[PDB]
Amino acid sequence: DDAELATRAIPELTKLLNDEDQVVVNKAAVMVHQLSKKEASRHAIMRSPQMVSAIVRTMQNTNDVETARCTAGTLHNLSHHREGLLAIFKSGGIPALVKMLGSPVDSVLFYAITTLHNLLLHQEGAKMAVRLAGGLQKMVALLNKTNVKFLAITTDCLQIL
Ligand SMILES: CN1C[C@@H](c2cccc(C#N)c2)Oc2ccccc2C1=O
């Protein structure tokens, strides 16, 4: 029933993610991120190409810190599934994630590189897409960070490319 109800709510949540009111978009992004933490509702989000497109679009245009963390966090969760990596890939997720590599918000930064690593690992076409978006230069720029786990994931992205 969790999956069926998340499924019905999706079109309205997709609509509110594209709203002009920034408080409406933030609240919808908080909602969708919460839905992405439960496997039944994460399944429903991955099956909606329109919903994944709205999370990508919102993530790359938002100036709201919580909105950026919630939307990148949502993509991070969906990237742990094959039917999730594919939806991110088709919705223009790679260029948006590459832009997020320039975030001063460290959780957005960690979510962005982990999702991109999951993509470079199992998504066909992700290698060339990361390169076309300038991800090679962006990832090299991060090698100056000091967190051990973050540096290793970033170095494996470059070792994969
Ligand atoms: C949310 N956001 C947009 C922008 C920003 C605006 C206002 C406050 C902060 C903080 N802290 C950051 O900075 C970014 C730059 C590049 C990629 C992504 C971000 C990003 O994460």
Residue numbers in the entry: 144 to 304
Please give the exact wording used by the authors of the publication that reports this structure.
Upon nuclear translocation, β‐catenin interacts with transcription factors of the TCF/LEF family to induce WNT target gene expression via recruitment of transcriptional co‐activators, such as CBP and BCL9. In particular, loss‐of‐function mutations in the tumor suppressor gene APC are present in approximately 80 % of colorectal cancers, resulting in impaired recruitment of β‐catenin to the destruction complex and WNT ligand‐independent stabilization of β‐catenin.
The racemic mixture of compound 6 and 7 showed an improved CSP pattern and was subsequently subjected to chiral separation. The consecutive NMR K d titration revealed that eutomer 6 exhibits improved affinity (NMR; K d=915±303 μM, Table 1, Figure 2c and 2 d) whereas distomer 7 did not show any CSPs at a concentration of 500 μM. Compound 6 finally enabled the co‐crystal structure determination in complex with β‐catenin141–305 at a resolution of 1.98 Å. The ligand's distinct three‐dimensional shape complements the pocket while orienting the N‐methyl lactam functionality towards the receptor. Thereby, the carbonyl moiety of compound 6 forms a hydrogen bond to the hydroxyl group of Ser246. The cyano substituent is solvent‐exposed, potentially acidifying the para CH via electron withdrawal and thus strengthening its interactions with the backbone carbonyl of Asn206. The binding site is located between armadillo repeats two and three, adjacent to the BCL9 and TCF4 binding sites.
